[PDB]
Design a protein around this ligand. Sequence first.
Ligand SMILES: [Zn+2]
Ligand SMILES: [Zn+2]
Ligand SMILES: [Zn+2]
Ligand SMILES: [Zn+2]
Lengths: 294, 294
Amino acid sequence: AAPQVRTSAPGYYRMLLGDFEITALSDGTVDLPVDKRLNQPAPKTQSALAKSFQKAPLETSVTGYLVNTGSKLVLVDTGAAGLFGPTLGRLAANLKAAGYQPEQVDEVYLTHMHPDHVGGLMVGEQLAFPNAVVRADQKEADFWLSQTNLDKAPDDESKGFFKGAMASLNPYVKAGKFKPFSGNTDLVPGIKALASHGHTPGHTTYVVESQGQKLALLGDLILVAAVQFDDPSVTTDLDSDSKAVAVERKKAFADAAKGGYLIAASHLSFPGIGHIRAEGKGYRFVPVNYSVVN
Amino acid sequence: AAPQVRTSAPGYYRMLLGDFEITALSDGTVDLPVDKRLNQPAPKTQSALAKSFQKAPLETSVTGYLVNTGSKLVLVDTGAAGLFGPTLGRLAANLKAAGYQPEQVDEVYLTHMHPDHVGGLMVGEQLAFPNAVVRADQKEADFWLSQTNLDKAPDDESKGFFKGAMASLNPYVKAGKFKPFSGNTDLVPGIKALASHGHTPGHTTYVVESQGQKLALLGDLILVAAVQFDDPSVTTDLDSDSKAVAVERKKAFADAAKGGYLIAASHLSFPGIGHIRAEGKGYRFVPVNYSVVN
Ligand SMILES: [Zn+2]
Ligand SMILES: [Zn+2]
Ligand SMILES: [Zn+2]
Ligand SMILES: [Zn+2]
């Protein structure tokens, strides 16, 4: 007779990294036809999913990462807001439930400008982080914010990716709040941009370092853990440069396994944080041990 | 900027299982000298922990599991309250964060009577679940509630175990609220007791099943994931019967890998829920995919 509550706990996850505080912020999840996206036979993807006890369209987390360096509050990726269906757009509420207000964010860094990463930049026609400067790679902005690329896009879904980027960033560009970088660049003390182009022309990894503790925020360098850890060579039809993304993925996996530091990625099962170990033909992902933060 | 919150999310995790609602409830974490407790050379244990990127004082979570069948509210294990140091005892508050009150709990099932599972039966020196019947195996109660085993215990660590169990259950015994079972027993519709004796003389697994979806609450059949998934035969000095616990753990692992259903265990990294598959001489735990519950 006790009612079922049936609400997930607030989607934020707290982790110390040296003297910095990290908060994975969930935007929700969305079901993706990953077998149709991956560049390999659908039964092969089907089987890899089933080995990890997944199938059919796959419920995929969408996550952004809040870094409090003690002097700046930085958000890496912003979820989708309302751009990508009604199951997403939760990052704003989870930012507040994690004890921060959007106005308190100093900078927003974008791994890339796909809709599930930039949508959160806007709430209606108002800036969602009115106090922040938005940073991403020059090559990312130059590709996605190009009117000519939009009008030449050969389908409504592609056009929609361009429109979503424009609707999400151009308010900041026009307000003088967009500050691009090019390639490997020191950002806020404690965070650097690391070029990992190929999923998109300007796709960027954000590397957080404090007191010798490292965390590489890989954005969309990996999209389907149950396939691409074992086989980092499998790509998707959403990658701008397949061979580049395979190179940059293998690079990040080998470097993280050698150094033994944490990685995170937007679409690993929330909170999406853990270590990586070279195993057999590929890699094994080891989710971070639950730790209470006081 | 912002001052760092450094406060973890509430320790509850919501998961649907058929028509039932499951809530993993965190009691906190505690650092354990697993290298001194496991029955194997320390070189082996350091190796395994480092393989999983872990050190030695393993920060170990302590979890209880709430089952709302829609008709009954059942709690499986209760954390340590104040019996096992100041980092545990979070379960009461996290049950409340999960949308429930202690008065709503109809039945409490104990995998076994160690302090980090029975402590939460008592708040202050007063009943934490005033409307609940408490169930455990008869062998469990007969062993831990024995005044003579207390007075006969070799060390004061074991003496504390007996005293903790007495202090936690005897109030319910005197209120007429302890209803033991013996071995495999159909409890509340949807929940079965399965005998998994050997960590304790009456350690019991609780098998939850709704609309064909199964979840096996293993209690303490595994204590150190970084060791005992790859080598289920390794036991600890805390296990009453090492041969029995080896056999029962291997049986649970083989059965869940055959059946492909979910398991949960008290000291796997919170929430401690996932699938299991055979890998080599042992097994590889696959944490449940994050899913949003509405
Ligand atoms: Zn993307
Ligand atoms: Zn994405
Ligand atoms: Zn135990
Ligand atoms: Zn225990």
